[model samples]
Target chain A: AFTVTVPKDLYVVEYGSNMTIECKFPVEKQLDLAALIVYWEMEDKNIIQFVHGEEDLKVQHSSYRQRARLLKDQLSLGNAALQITDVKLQDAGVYRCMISYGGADYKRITVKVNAPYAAALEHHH
Target chain B: AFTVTVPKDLYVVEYGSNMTIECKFPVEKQLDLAALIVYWEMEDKNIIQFVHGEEDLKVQHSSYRQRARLLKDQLSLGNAALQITDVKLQDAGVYRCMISYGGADYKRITVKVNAPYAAALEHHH
Candidate 1:
């Protein structure tokens, strides 16, 4: 049985910054992009999804649209990391990544965002 | 103009623990509960809502059903706090509390949840 692995199960990022949550899976010689499927979610909300090597954005959550993406170029090497840009306070939560290559396996990552500047401003007000 | 206040802008809680996010507004001798409307949201998803002092569960997010509630009795005293039981990792995020009493105002509270037990188990695996 193949297992999914994340370099770190927990990630801490600063608000408004870019974040990459890394996940790796076992890959044989060359992966058939057309047969691979990848899905990412947070609290049952779809962040991004891939099917047949292409992104399927129709079902992606509106808030995450244009702000999240998977590194398709590295998929062949078992790299299924997710990158999110301009992370906001609302993005602090747990995320799940599922891969389907012949069979399916999944892993979860927790994200904690800090907004020190924003908090300072709120305190001033 | 009335203002909304949250005891703290950020809250940290352990997984599976119960939490109360305190928010307050101005109240006169007696508040007209019939004219009050309270709405709570996390990432555009409704957690709970109160209309005319009654909970409108029809639009509440399924994941929060029976898990989140507003202190109704305290509403009259301008205590529009929210209570969440058996918190999970997905519950970590920014929550907005919007109140409509003649006029509307809202405040946000950021929640960070830690699951040391789960993390330890994942590490062991």
Candidate 2:
């Protein structure tokens, strides 16, 4: 049985910054991009999806339309990370990455967003 | 000089929920809605703008295009509150409300979004 792995189960990111949730799967030799299917979801809402190596946005949540993406190049190497740009406070939650290559496997990553600037302002006052 | 006020200097909202950032200005008797101008900004980017009592989207940030709105009816009652629906992690930050009526004044309100559900999940495990 193949296993899925994430660099960190919990990711801490600064507000308004870009972040990547890393996920990796076991590969035998080479990955056929066209045959790979990937799906990223947060709070059961579609963040991004890949079908036959092409992006499908029909069901992608509007909030993440232009802010979330998967690293296609890394997919060939068993990397299925999802990158979210301009991360917001509402983006803090558990994200699930589902992969369908030879078989199906999925992993969940929890994101914790913090606003250090707000803390600094409080201290200054 | 007129003063702008917010219900709280800091607002704490749950992730994925609708929230209102309360802002108010002194009204002599009745607010002249048509002549009032209000602008909301975060990180120097336009979240929403009302010019001549009508919403102007030409300069609104893409991320907040359809998510942020001001309560038009409340203007007559000295309210200039902004409501954001389906708040995201990126939505946590300082928001400035600029009012241009007779004179100009602005106030900043800090928002802190939290995902209590994520915390509950962690506790469960």
- Per-residue alpha-carbon lDDT of candidate 2 for residues B43-117, written as tens digits (9 for 90 to 100): 667887777668988879899977988888888888888999988767888887877565444667889878777
How does model 1 fare in lDDT?
0.80
lDDT of 2 at B60: 91
Per-residue C-alpha lDDT of model 2 across residues A1-125, encoded as one tens digit per residue: 44688889999998889998888987888887654667788865788877766777887999897999888888878899799999887788899786656444467899998877775465357
Looking at candidate 1 chain A, the ten consecutive residues that score lowest on lDDT are A98-107
**Model 1 ranges with Cα > 4 A deviation:** A117-125, B1-125
| Candidate 2: chain B TM-score against the reference chain B | 0.88
Docking class for model 1 is incorrect
Per-residue alpha-carbon lDDT of model 1 for A1-125, expressed as tens digits?
45788889999998889999888988988887765667788876788777767777987899898999998887988989899999887788989887756444467899998888866476357
Name model 2 segments beyond 4 Å from true.
Answer: A116-125, B1-125
lDDT of 2 at A78: 88
